[PDB]
Design a protein around this ligand. Structure first.
Ligand SMILES: *[C@@H]1O[C@H](CO[C@@H]2O[C@@H](C)[C@@H](O)[C@@H](O)[C@@H]2O)[C@@H](O[C@@H]2O[C@H](CO)[C@@H](O[C@@H]3O[C@H](CO[C@H]4O[C@H](CO)[C@@H](O)[C@H](O)[C@@H]4O)[C@@H](O)[C@H](O[C@H]4O[C@H](CO)[C@@H](O)[C@H](O)[C@@H]4O)[C@@H]3O)[C@H](O)[C@H]2NC(C)=O)[C@H](O)[C@H]1NC(C)=O
Ligand SMILES: *[C@@H]1O[C@H](CO[C@@H]2O[C@@H](C)[C@@H](O)[C@@H](O)[C@@H]2O)[C@@H](O[C@@H]2O[C@H](CO)[C@@H](O[C@@H]3O[C@H](CO[C@H]4O[C@H](CO)[C@@H](O)[C@H](O)[C@@H]4O)[C@@H](O)[C@H](O[C@H]4O[C@H](CO)[C@@H](O)[C@H](O)[C@@H]4O)[C@@H]3O)[C@H](O)[C@H]2NC(C)=O)[C@H](O)[C@H]1NC(C)=O
Ligand code: HEM
Ligand code: HEM
Ligand code: NAG
Ligand code: NAG
Ligand code: NAG
Ligand code: NAG
Ligand code: BR
Ligand code: BR
Ligand code: BR
Ligand code: BR
Ligand code: BR
Ligand code: BR
Ligand code: BR
Ligand code: BR
Ligand code: CA
Ligand code: CA
Lengths: 466, 104, 466, 104
């Protein structure tokens, strides 16, 4: 049974059925396409069905380098001894490198503009082309690797290709860890949750299970609440870059042609820096660009991302809201009144109650994004517990964590302490004005912007082997 | 696992020497809580018509989205203290952490 | 193949290698027979191999009733509506019920005495004939079920077969829970570990995982250190049952014929009551009856139970001593000196280090039984933690726990509180003098004994339907 | 799982309503800690010649048994405070809780 073209419920399809008086799909014979996640143990009449993580759990920039040896190999430039990642051999972004194209059997990117004939990009992860803003970040890190590899070849002449690649790969990974725990996570969790779930690092602990928990795959989708209905692009002076400065997100998904033919990554990165994220409010959860029109250009029907999240949590056999609250040592509301109190919103509690009947059955993504956000944070207590617990494990249970004794020298850690996302943008783009740290807070130009010249670039002197 | 190494493996194998596959690619996720399936081992809630969950009807995912998530875009509230880069780093980071394969 | 008859290491075999100059197995290329436990997910290149529990984890007397429906039905007497368990149709024990014979493909009991032709017994669990003492306990509870069913039938004449069976089964399960938690576990763990891991029952908690943990299957094998090298049989005045009151254990394994043809279960049960268990000591861990001659009559050579326990822990991928110490929140000895301190025995720690190299590699069974015993307990801190944690879960995570609200009436719970192993023996055998409570401590006749006549019967009045 | 029930099922199924296989027969054991195998996922330590466990040779179970467990039978110490029945209930109870199947 073809899950993409049929609404029949049979393995491995789990189509979302359509309710009566649906705002968009008036045909209740239709459905939202859904493929069940691959079972870890197919056909077993013994195991409790589990799902598979195809990537390394570690914050190791695997979305740059890949999580399988064949891929990691194919992503490298193996035509010289410079330790570089291969770049696009058909296009450049105002002199700079693009990601190589991929060879996909049913390339969705081509369908976003039949004229353009621009396929999806090839990267460490298979979703790099899903939105141009994501593609731009992959492109950024790709360039930083090559730049590091180049400077590294300068400091240490003897270092061969393999050495260059690995040392450059090691710095990029550290950069991803640093940006993530120093700048990103504190603004996700807020002050209190950050102190609680990520106490000061001590050192590697080999008893700390670093695997991603099934529940994390759904809870961390909290980000879907931060999505704006447009892709914003701005010129070198951060003004709307015509003729299409604000394209609907439903016409940017897999649109790799926009990166190649519409100005490169500079206009995209500026848009990310100088545009406010959407705020998560209890009656403004997620925009219709993803709730009604997700992937509209590349399949028979527009998808509903929030709907997919709830369908997926059930596909994965994930416990309901109260089980996760209990797990997190948080009170479990049983009445609509109790729920109202936990949510500080009686109206929302009522809607949830009328849909689910009991707070025990609220799907984890729905319940999670439904809680009022913690002070200076962007998730509630439940998601904070789930996300913070996950990241502590990814940190403490990683033998190659950048601060672990032995990974980097004391002076190498000093050097890495000076890296920033703004700085990386400065080193690999035409953009000479970038957001002030913290880049995830700054969002108003020119008030929150500074010239690149005032920001010190990574000093690799302590990488000298001499 | 090699007694000594210099860098991460590409798959993550051997990061944890006592349990070599932990954190590595193409491995089952860890369960922080026992899974909850309609038949207790494999079918998702909402699969079989008339089958309730814990005493109550399973709500259609699309119905919950329509009822609780749907909102008029003109009400959208720009986050005065977060950049859109905040959203983007999130997605990028999610893509360093997990990808859940499905059949083609 | 046949792991029982060759030393080839190929699936599903994992034969134990023999050390040079072994005191028994002189051909260093030979081995000890061992079959790998069945994997939960056969041939998987994704899943981390795990093993299977073929039994219900709950303390529900499944060793009596069966944990699979077809077997469950086959243990039941369906020739009438008396709700009874099937009994042996060939033999009786001084006019009382024996377990029925099983129908095995390669029946090992047949091999223990070729001329007797007595096959293994059929029970709720497949190991009932492993040793006559075990067989005797199985027989006891079978009788208790039929006794309870009969009494309930007189009190409740309208109650059909199914109802009587279920009600009797429920009582039997309750008895096993009570004897286990009131009488048995306190003497295993010691008072301190009992308060710690087994605090006052409050109520059923549907979020408590009641499954058996993999390590428990190995850790609960601490009991092997309690085994005496003989099966003791006593007559009705508790004196040696001639002509052979002390049978070497190596000649009673799977020896069902001894139950049927050598006096039945009375001499066996008296033997169990009036003989001390073996005390575990650091230089007296387990006897050669099981270390050199385990199953000698039904195998090509004698097996080694202690060595099988360690091979099994490896087969199951179980972490070493220190990881389990860490899990349990106990200090992790890293050097011989430190291990010496933890064990209160530097010599033993020295022997362990000469064999294992590091405390991190000591097998759980070996490390576990090596620890000094807790006060008034028969295990050390590590085993105390593992066993105590397992039983807490089995109690708190069981919706049919005898003390759980709604299972039994208040009047029923009061009646059940009066049950005891000594009284059950009185009710189902020809023995008229039994051990004083606690039956697990009492071990010296006549000192620790009394007449059955001084022990009241279980009052079933509150089971009468009004 | 039925709405109400007065008796346990034979298999243990439905004891736990939210996750009905928990404690039920013919299910994998729960792991309190990650498994430790030679190859990370299935080969037991002692399987491959020359393969050490965390820097030291895997000690033969039979050697450990010989050097540490073996003791003179006539040295056996009778437990003054426990009956043999204490040993026997243990095994009987163990057989209510777990049986790890092996191929015949
Ligand atoms: C019903 O039983 C539930 C299970 O209880 C366990 O089993 C019973 C038999 C007892 O032995 C009991 O003591 C056991 O805990 C029980 O739910 C449990 O409740 C606890 C306490 O709230 C929960 O612990 C909290 O966990 C979260 C999440 O992290 C945990 O899980 C991860 C993944 O395995 C581990 O890596 C962690 O180390 C934890 O184990 C933690 O965030 C939280 O700690 C934080 O908060 C406390 C307090 O501020 C601080 O001390 C810490 O430093 C942290 O800041 C706790 O560790 C547990 O997750 C939960 N389990 C389940 C299955 O839900 C429930 O309360 C019982 N109800 C009743 C009425 O008895
Ligand atoms: C290295 O990391 C180890 C893992 O630490 C966890 O994850 C990291 C990221 C941190 O967030 C950390 O806070 C987390 O704990 C860490 O080992 C851990 O150490 C704790 C504390 O010793 C252990 O907890 C104890 O567990 C035992 C066993 O029960 C547990 O498991 C069962 C079944 O799986 C559950 O149902 C229970 O709820 C428990 O989770 C308990 O018996 C014990 O509680 C008893 O003791 C305390 C104190 O006396 C009493 O107050 C209680 O009431 C109980 O009587 C603890 O809960 C944890 O098992 C262990 N994990 C592992 C994998 O070993 C290690 O210490 C770290 N080392 C360093 C240097 O950082
Ligand atoms: C450009 C913005 C983003 C998308 C477009 C997008 C899309 C998806 C889709 C299609 C899935 C799968 C849905 C399903 O279950 O069928 C999905 C999964 C996940 N996301 Fe999404 N996402 C966009 C943006 C974000 C951001 C900002 C996130 C985090 C802050 C985020 C997270 C996730 C996660 C963790 C998943 C699961 C991934 C897996 O396969 O393991 N997303 N998103
Ligand atoms: C009459 C006394 C006992 C035995 C004879 C006996 C034998 C064994 C054997 C052969 C195994 C399996 C060995 C292997 O892995 O190859 C075994 C397993 C277990 N035991 Fe043993 N046992 C006798 C007595 C006891 C007592 C007193 C115990 C508990 C107090 C005890 C426990 C266990 C446990 C829990 C196991 C594992 C069971 C499973 O398959 O899950 N034993 N024993
Ligand atoms: C490899 O590197 C060389 C030198 O930078 C470059 O000319 C070539 O295009 C690169 N190859 C690929 C596939 O990126
Ligand atoms: C498609 O790409 C072409 C370039 O081939 C461009 O001219 C056109 O504007 C794009 N079409 C749309 C609908 O954006
Ligand atoms: C069933 O019970 C009846 C009466 O107790 C008895 O005649 C018969 O032997 C029993 N059948 C079996 C198989 O135990
Ligand atoms: C075997 O059983 C018979 C009874 O069939 C008995 O007379 C004989 O003594 C037994 N043999 C041994 C060695 O115990
Ligand atoms: Br290309
Ligand atoms: Br995506
Ligand atoms: Br600029
Ligand atoms: Br989970
Ligand atoms: Br029979
Ligand atoms: Br046995
Ligand atoms: Br007597
Ligand atoms: Br375990
Ligand atoms: Ca990764
Ligand atoms: Ca049981």
């Amino acid at each position: 049974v073809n899950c993409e073209t049929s609404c029949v419920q049979q393995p491995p399809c789990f189509p979302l059925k359509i309710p009566p008086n649906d705002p968009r799909i008036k045909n209740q014979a239709d459905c939202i396409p859904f493929f069940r996640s691959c079972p870890a143990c197919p056909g077993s009449n013994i195991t409790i069905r589990n799902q598979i993580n195809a990537l390394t759990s570690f914050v190791d920039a695997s979305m740059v380098y890949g999580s399988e040896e064949p891929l990691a190999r194919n992503l490298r430039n193996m035509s010289n001894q410079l330790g570089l990642l291969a770049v696009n051999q058909r296009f450049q972004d105002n002199g700079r490198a693009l990601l190589p194209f991929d060879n996909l059997h049913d390339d969705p990117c081509l369908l976003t503009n039949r004229s353009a004939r621009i396929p999806c990009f090839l990267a460490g992860d298979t979703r790099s082309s899903e939105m141009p803003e994501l593609t731009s970040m992959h492109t950024l890190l790709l360039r930083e690797h090559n730049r590091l590899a180049t400077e590294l070849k300068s400091l240490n002449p003897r270092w061969d290709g393999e050495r260059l690649y690995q040392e450059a790969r090691k710095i990029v990974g550290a950069m991803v860890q640093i940006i993530t725990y120093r700048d990103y996570l504190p603004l996700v969790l807020g002050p209190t949750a950050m102190r609680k779930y990520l106490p000061t690092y001590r050192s590697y602990n080999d008893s700390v299970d670093p695997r991603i928990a099934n529940v994390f795959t759904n809870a961390f989708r909290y980000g879907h609440t931060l999505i704006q209905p447009f892709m914003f692009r701005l010129d070198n002076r951060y003004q709307p870059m015509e003729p299409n400065p604000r394209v609907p997100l439903s016409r940017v998904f897999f649109a790799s042609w926009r990166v190649v033919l519409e100005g490169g990554i500079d206009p995209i990165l500026r848009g990310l820096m100088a545009t406010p994220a959407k705020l998560n409010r209890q009656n403004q959860i997620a925009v219709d660009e993803i709730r009604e029109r997700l992937f509209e250009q590349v399949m028979r029907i527009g998808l509903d991302l929030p709907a997919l999240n709830m369908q997926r949590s059930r596909d994965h056999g994930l416990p309901g809201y109260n089980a996760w609250r209990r797990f997190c040592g948080l009170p479990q509301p049983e009445t609509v009144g109790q729920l109202g109190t936990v949510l500080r919103n009686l109206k929302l509690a009522r809607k949830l109650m009328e849909q689910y009947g009991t707070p025990n059955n609220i799907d984890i993504w729905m319940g999670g994004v439904s809680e009022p956000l913690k002070r200076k944070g962007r998730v509630g207590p439940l998601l904070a517990c789930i996300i913070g617990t996950q990241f502590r494990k990814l940190r403490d249970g990683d033998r190659f964590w950048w601060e672990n004794e032995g990974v980097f020298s004391m002076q190498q850690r000093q050097a890495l302490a000076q890296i920033s996302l703004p700085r990386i943008i400065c080193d690999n783009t035409g953009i000479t004005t970038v957001s002030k740290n913290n880049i995830f807070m700054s969002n108003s130009y020119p008030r929150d912007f500074v010239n690149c010249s005032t920001l010190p670039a990574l000093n690799l002197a302590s990488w000298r082997e001499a | 696992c090699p007694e000594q190494d210099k860098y991460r493996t590409i798959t993550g194998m051997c990061n944890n020497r006592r349990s070599p596959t932990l954190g590595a690619s193409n491995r089952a996720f860890v369960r922080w809580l026992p899974a909850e399936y309609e038949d207790g081992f494999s079918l998702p809630y909402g699969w079989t018509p008339g089958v309730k969950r814990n005493g109550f009807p399973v709500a259609l995912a699309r119905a919950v989205s329509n009822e609780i998530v749907r909102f008029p875009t003109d009400q959208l509230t720009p986050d005065q203290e977060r950049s859109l880069m905040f959203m983007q780093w999130g997605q990028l980071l999610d893509h360093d952490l997990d990808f859940t394969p499905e059949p083609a």
